[PDB]
Amino acid sequence: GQVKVFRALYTFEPRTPDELYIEEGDIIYITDMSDTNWWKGTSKGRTGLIPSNYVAEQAESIDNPLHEAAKRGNLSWLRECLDNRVGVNGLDKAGSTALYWACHGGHKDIVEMLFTQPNIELNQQNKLGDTALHAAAWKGYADIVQLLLAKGARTDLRNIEKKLAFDMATNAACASLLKKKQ
């Protein structure tokens, strides 16, 4: 089963010892949804049981928690998402990955962190045909471009306007990193 993420809107006090305690605003990671009434989840490092009904009514489904953490420069939450086995290669409504957003925003920590994850897809293209590397070049982040290249990002992929990551760069250091040696 795939992990689903929520935010607690209200507080839940456990009635048994196997039940999970959750405060308003806390983030909940649901790992097992097989039972009708009782879900298994993690919240603030602890693992317990939580009624599907509390989740449906007093909590809030977050569709792309990893993407969201990346966009906002939230290293901690991203780290928490990854520790709770949220998929690194999940695509948002625009076809972008968490890596795409972290590069798009120039967050070196978040980028380097996603790099330590198994199976991280560097070359995913979104609906507009952009890779993470297109975005880092466009936005002029030379260090992110370097890091993408070092990790082996593809430089041959073309977006919907037929433009390479190179054709996106206007910053001189990015342009230089992405042109072919002679």
UniProtKB/Swiss-Prot annotation:
Supply the alphabetized keyword list: Acetylation, ANK repeat, Cytoplasm, Phosphoprotein, Repeat, SH3 domain
Q: What is its main location?
A: cytoplasm
Keyword Kinase belongs to the record: no
Q: What is known of its domains?
A: The SH3 domain mediates interaction with SMN1.
Q: Which GO terms describe its cellular component?
A: extracellular region; ficolin-1-rich granule lumen; secretory granule lumen
Q: Which Gene3D superfamilies match?
A: Ankyrin repeat-containing domain, SH3 Domains
Its assembly, as annotated, is:
Interacts with SRC and SMN1. Interacts with FASLG.
Q: Where are the ANK repeats?
A: 61-90, 94-124, 128-157
Task: Identify the domain of life.
Answer: Eukaryota
Any one Gene Ontology MF annotation carried by this entry is: SH3 domain binding
Q: Which PROSITE patterns match?
A: ANK_REP_REGION, ANK_REPEAT, SH3
Whether Electron transport counts among this entry's keywords is no
Domain SH3 as annotated: residue spans: 1-60
Give the UniProt record's GO annotations in the biological process aspect. Answer: ossification; signal transduction
Gene of origin?
Answer: OSTF1
Under what name is this protein listed?
Answer: Osteoclast-stimulating factor 1
The record lists the organism as Homo sapiens
User: Localized where?
Assistant: Cytoplasm
Q: In which tissues is it expressed?
A: Ubiquitously expressed. Present in osteoclasts (at protein level).
Which N-terminal stretch is annotated as signal sequence? none
